Design an enzyme around this catalytic site. Sequence first.
Site, PDB file in Angstrom:
ATOM      1  N   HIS A  23      -3.987  14.401  -1.870  1.00  0.00           N
ATOM      2  CA  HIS A  23      -4.321  15.395  -2.881  1.00  0.00           C
ATOM      3  C   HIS A  23      -3.825  16.777  -2.525  1.00  0.00           C
ATOM      4  CE1 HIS A  23      -7.615  12.939  -5.129  1.00  0.00           C
ATOM      5  NE2 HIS A  23      -6.447  12.323  -5.116  1.00  0.00           N
TER       6      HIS A  23
ATOM      7  N   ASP B 126      -1.672   8.632  -1.560  1.00  0.00           N
ATOM      8  CA  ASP B 126      -1.688   9.791  -2.442  1.00  0.00           C
ATOM      9  C   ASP B 126      -2.494  10.885  -1.703  1.00  0.00           C
ATOM     10  OD1 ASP B 126      -3.690  10.498  -5.534  1.00  0.00           O
ATOM     11  OD2 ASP B 126      -2.211  11.780  -4.559  1.00  0.00           O
TER      12      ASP B 126
ATOM     13  N   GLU C 212     -28.978  24.398  -0.847  1.00  0.00           N
ATOM     14  CA  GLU C 212     -29.969  23.399  -0.481  1.00  0.00           C
ATOM     15  C   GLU C 212     -29.278  22.040  -0.634  1.00  0.00           C
ATOM     16  OE1 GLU C 212     -33.521  22.541  -3.233  1.00  0.00           O
ATOM     17  OE2 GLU C 212     -32.421  23.862  -4.554  1.00  0.00           O
ATOM     18  N   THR C 213     -28.576  21.867  -1.745  1.00  0.00           N
ATOM     19  CA  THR C 213     -27.870  20.635  -2.045  1.00  0.00           C
ATOM     20  C   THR C 213     -26.615  21.013  -2.832  1.00  0.00           C
ATOM     21  OG1 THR C 213     -30.011  19.553  -2.305  1.00  0.00           O
ATOM     22  CG2 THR C 213     -28.062  18.385  -3.129  1.00  0.00           C
TER      23      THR C 213
ATOM     24  N   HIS D 161     -26.869  17.031   1.394  1.00  0.00           N
ATOM     25  CA  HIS D 161     -28.027  17.841   1.701  1.00  0.00           C
ATOM     26  C   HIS D 161     -28.432  17.526   3.129  1.00  0.00           C
ATOM     27  CE1 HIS D 161     -32.092  19.628   0.699  1.00  0.00           C
ATOM     28  NE2 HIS D 161     -32.373  18.945   1.791  1.00  0.00           N
TER      29      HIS D 161
ATOM     30  N   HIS E 279      -8.233  -0.708  -4.254  1.00  0.00           N
ATOM     31  CA  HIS E 279      -7.931  -0.278  -2.901  1.00  0.00           C
ATOM     32  C   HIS E 279      -8.875   0.803  -2.433  1.00  0.00           C
ATOM     33  CE1 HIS E 279      -3.865  -2.177  -1.965  1.00  0.00           C
ATOM     34  NE2 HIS E 279      -4.446  -2.888  -2.954  1.00  0.00           N
TER      35      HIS E 279
ATOM     36  N   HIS F  89       0.856  -1.182   0.000  1.00  0.00           N
ATOM     37  CA  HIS F  89       0.000   0.000   0.000  1.00  0.00           C
ATOM     38  C   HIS F  89       0.891   1.231   0.000  1.00  0.00           C
ATOM     39  CE1 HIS F  89      -3.269  -2.647   1.310  1.00  0.00           C
ATOM     40  NE2 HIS F  89      -2.374  -3.175   2.165  1.00  0.00           N
TER      41      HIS F  89
ATOM     42  N   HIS G 295      -5.718   8.914  -0.476  1.00  0.00           N
ATOM     43  CA  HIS G 295      -6.121   7.542  -0.704  1.00  0.00           C
ATOM     44  C   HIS G 295      -4.950   6.703  -1.145  1.00  0.00           C
ATOM     45  CE1 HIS G 295      -6.027   8.060  -5.133  1.00  0.00           C
ATOM     46  NE2 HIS G 295      -6.558   9.257  -4.952  1.00  0.00           N
ATOM     47  N   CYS G 296      -5.094   5.389  -1.016  1.00  0.00           N
ATOM     48  CA  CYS G 296      -4.053   4.460  -1.425  1.00  0.00           C
ATOM     49  C   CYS G 296      -4.145   4.347  -2.939  1.00  0.00           C
ATOM     50  CB  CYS G 296      -4.291   3.096  -0.782  1.00  0.00           C
ATOM     51  SG  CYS G 296      -3.064   1.800  -1.154  1.00  0.00           S
TER      52      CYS G 296
ATOM     53  N   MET H  17     -10.011   2.317   1.424  1.00  0.00           N
ATOM     54  CA  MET H  17      -8.698   2.925   1.654  1.00  0.00           C
ATOM     55  C   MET H  17      -8.536   4.375   1.183  1.00  0.00           C
ATOM     56  SD  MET H  17      -5.118   0.762   1.745  1.00  0.00           S
ATOM     57  CE  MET H  17      -3.749   1.449   2.695  1.00  0.00           C
TER      58      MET H  17
ATOM     59  N   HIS I  67     -28.225  13.476  -1.811  1.00  0.00           N
ATOM     60  CA  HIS I  67     -29.553  13.663  -2.411  1.00  0.00           C
ATOM     61  C   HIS I  67     -30.017  12.940  -3.666  1.00  0.00           C
ATOM     62  CE1 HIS I  67     -33.556  15.528  -2.401  1.00  0.00           C
ATOM     63  NE2 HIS I  67     -33.290  16.178  -1.287  1.00  0.00           N
TER      64      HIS I  67
HETATM   65 CU   LIG Z   1      -3.741  -0.001  -0.311  1.00  0.00          CU
HETATM   66 CU   LIG Z   2      -6.298  10.731  -6.311  1.00  0.00          CU
HETATM   67 CU   LIG Z   3     -34.982  16.679  -0.232  1.00  0.00          CU
END
Ligand SMILES: [Cu+2]
Ligand SMILES: [Cu+2]
Ligand SMILES: [Cu+2]
Lengths: 337, 337, 337
Positions: free
Chosen positions: C97, C95, C276-277, C252, C142, C92, C132-133, C147, C303
């Site tokens: 971001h 990464d 709202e969303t 939401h 993964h 493993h 994330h892996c 992960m 939603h």
């Molecule tokens: Cu992994």
């Molecule tokens: Cu990524």
């Molecule tokens: Cu709704």
Amino acid sequence: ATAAEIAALPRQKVELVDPPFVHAHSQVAEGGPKVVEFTMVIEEKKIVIDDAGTEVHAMAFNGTVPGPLMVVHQDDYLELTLINPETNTLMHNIDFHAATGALGGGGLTEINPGEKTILRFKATKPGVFVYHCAPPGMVPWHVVSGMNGAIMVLPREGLHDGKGKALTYDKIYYVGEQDFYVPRDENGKYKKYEAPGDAYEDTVKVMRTLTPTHVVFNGAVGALTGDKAMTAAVGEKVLIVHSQANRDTRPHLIGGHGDYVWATGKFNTPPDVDQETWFIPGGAAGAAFYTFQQPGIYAYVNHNLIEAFELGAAAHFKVTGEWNDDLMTSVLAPSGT
Amino acid sequence: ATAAEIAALPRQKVELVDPPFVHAHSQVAEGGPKVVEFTMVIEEKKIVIDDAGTEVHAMAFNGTVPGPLMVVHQDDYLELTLINPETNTLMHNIDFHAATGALGGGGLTEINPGEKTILRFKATKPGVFVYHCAPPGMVPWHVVSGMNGAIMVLPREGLHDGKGKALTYDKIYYVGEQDFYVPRDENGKYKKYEAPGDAYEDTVKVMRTLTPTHVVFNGAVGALTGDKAMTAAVGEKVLIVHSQANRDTRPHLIGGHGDYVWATGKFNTPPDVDQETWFIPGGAAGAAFYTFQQPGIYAYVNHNLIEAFELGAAAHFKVTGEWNDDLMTSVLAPSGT
Amino acid sequence: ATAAEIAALPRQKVELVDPPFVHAHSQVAEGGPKVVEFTMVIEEKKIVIDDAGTEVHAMAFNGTVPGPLMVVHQDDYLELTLINPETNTLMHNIDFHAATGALGGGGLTEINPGEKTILRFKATKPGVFVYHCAPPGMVPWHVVSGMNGAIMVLPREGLHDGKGKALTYDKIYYVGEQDFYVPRDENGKYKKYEAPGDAYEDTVKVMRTLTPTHVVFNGAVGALTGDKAMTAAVGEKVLIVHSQANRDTRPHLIGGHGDYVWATGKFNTPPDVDQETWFIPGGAAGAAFYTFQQPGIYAYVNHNLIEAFELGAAAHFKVTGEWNDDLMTSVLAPSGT
Ligand SMILES: [Cu+2]
Ligand SMILES: [Cu+2]
Ligand SMILES: [Cu+2]
Ligand SMILES: [Cu+2]
Ligand SMILES: [Cu+2]
Ligand SMILES: [Cu+2]
């Protein structure tokens, strides 16, 4: 704010109109805050959604899919009387995404066939908001059976652009987009049921595929095309309110643009400009403003062309006026190579 | 405005180049408006999209999927001579989302095999826009057969960030993402056909599932890797234009970022800053500005990792330069626990 | 810049907590830049994702799905000791971001079972970012195995709205949304595998459908409900960080709104208001600030109501306080028609 003040506010009943048309209202608020009263009867009925005679046991507010657009101004109170006739077989309620508390009002309006209820709420935030039926335990089912709509809470001083400059539309249309999940038998023919509840199980299986069988405007494939196309003229300013209570959409006016688009639907959030295709997530409404410049027919669609032209998510705009050859001109018409 | 005025405008013939590169142009407009001429011949051909030998009957503008990027400045006129050789079997046309009128041009450009046409439109709005074929009643089919591309309408004074400071790029790349729906036989093997139309029926059923068999950059899995990897150098400012004419995408520069991202693709809508993953709805084009700070290989992908690494949506960047240990460093390289 | 200047920086080891909770921190930075240390051990463990007992062989950072939220300030250095136990069967990496270089750090942290590594990177950009892996060749496997997690890089001066006014939350929760792809047998029942390896082939087949079998918060259907429901009070300002490392989502708060939403998750990108969303594309994190105004239960969902209530993406909020009748009131409770 006080009990005395709220009770003293003016009461005003409004007559609703079926989409994509909108009831009478003023962009800029007339007078002070008022309690705007609306009433909608819920209708459970079979509707045909395509040219193949495909039926859906619709659960519609005011008898329409989507429900009509309610228009109020910021800080007004929306007092809705919802009625669920004894002839219906299900319990319904309403969730206003514009409201604060009780799950949008869903928890205070659960009515069985033979009941009515009156809910009031202060529209404290400006924008276009979705509203939908949400009975606990079967929320998606009701929403994807057509039980949803939207409301427009206009700023007291009307719409404006990014730099405070006023935007006044000449026309407004409400396009409610619906994703349907109709079951098919082993042969591939859509199925018909006696009662709404009979379809429940088969429908849920289709729903979980996350792949709608139909994606429509105003409840049916072609509901907004042909003679039912929306109209405008060159020079005219149009506001096209759009909603999708359960699934993402990407509106696009083929031939035009969204000059100002409140993509999130919230008026306090500056509109994006010169939009080619905007995006509205599931469970939200959005609004696009555009001044028509060229006449002819326009195609307003969900820009996933498969959903637009294969599933049914396409509407038309019939525009009158004079052509502009500076904007576009056929230098050499289609001819021999 | 007047045809007279336009006729007096300087004209310039531009030479198009295959994606991901963009034809020569100036960021800051050199002179007053001009009528920028382009010519593209439509080529119907088989393309191999993966190392398993899967074929797609492409309908390619200028011979490539996606079609080449055309660059003009705001208020210039783009004049396109579209040719549909007699070697083709289908009628084709072209809709520029950047244009106004006649469904973006598709209504004035329907040319059968052996025909050509010339279209002129004023690029009134600055931004990157999608263009694609759209024959009435066969729209999605042509688009998902790779008949789409993009144009960039730069502001006269070039690119700028939200606060007006100038954003000048050293390199520009055009990444066209395509969603293919390739039929399979009862054994799960992708089918091959001797003619475009022979695959229509089979392809429409796959399209309806709304699930692409392949999602690729520049027409094939791995297209933009190895001999076709994009390059840059630490210190270089690069603009990555991305388009998706039919389906949503969420671009991501693994190891880097989107310093400035015009997610809607419209330059009059301020860019988002410090983006990890941006979103572009199907039917639009977006653009991201990024200054490389670290040498090494990067991977540009559609961040739905299944789409990126199972379906084919991944491209590479080979960046040269000095490693910056302040930004990132291996304090303890992989070793014993 | 120099390793000597970085080494002369104060260091602070942080004790992580399981989501939805966040380890202690200060919104406004405590003094100058520091190297913030964290440690996480990777655990390959079987988890149960629903009440029927569906199990998934998860790949969890710190033993949780999602991984914990690490919090640092802009210009701080995040130094992570990542450990891969001998009892694990797979290699493993991670990464980030938020990081710049070597594929977000993935290229410098490839550790096999029995190994550990220490990676340090400068948190140069403010906002929430997923981590994330990403083992080359098995990236999506993964990630959709749980992960992934997220980090928050707060501006050294805390949060502010788009106009500079400060935004200080009273509480903060981290909602990691996970899309799972669980194979089923010929009867539609979910399958169980002895070793994670035995699940790979079948799982890949489901992933390719791009239709998850479960969409959940904190690793399981209903994880954030009942006694695990998040809490608040009327007048309480809550920041809800939400991430989805592989698939789109649209949060939401049913009954509420997202007063200020950094939908792109980048604090240098002004927040949208009165949402709202909102929308968070796969491969990213977003944050929503909301001041509760009404008491009772709230459902925080993705939603697409089918995902929310059929697939598992619904969480609850228990809120104490006094009901506000001005904002909302039942004028007439469900009663005879
Ligand atoms: Cu992994
Ligand atoms: Cu990524
Ligand atoms: Cu709704
Ligand atoms: Cu209902
Ligand atoms: Cu074509
Ligand atoms: Cu189009």
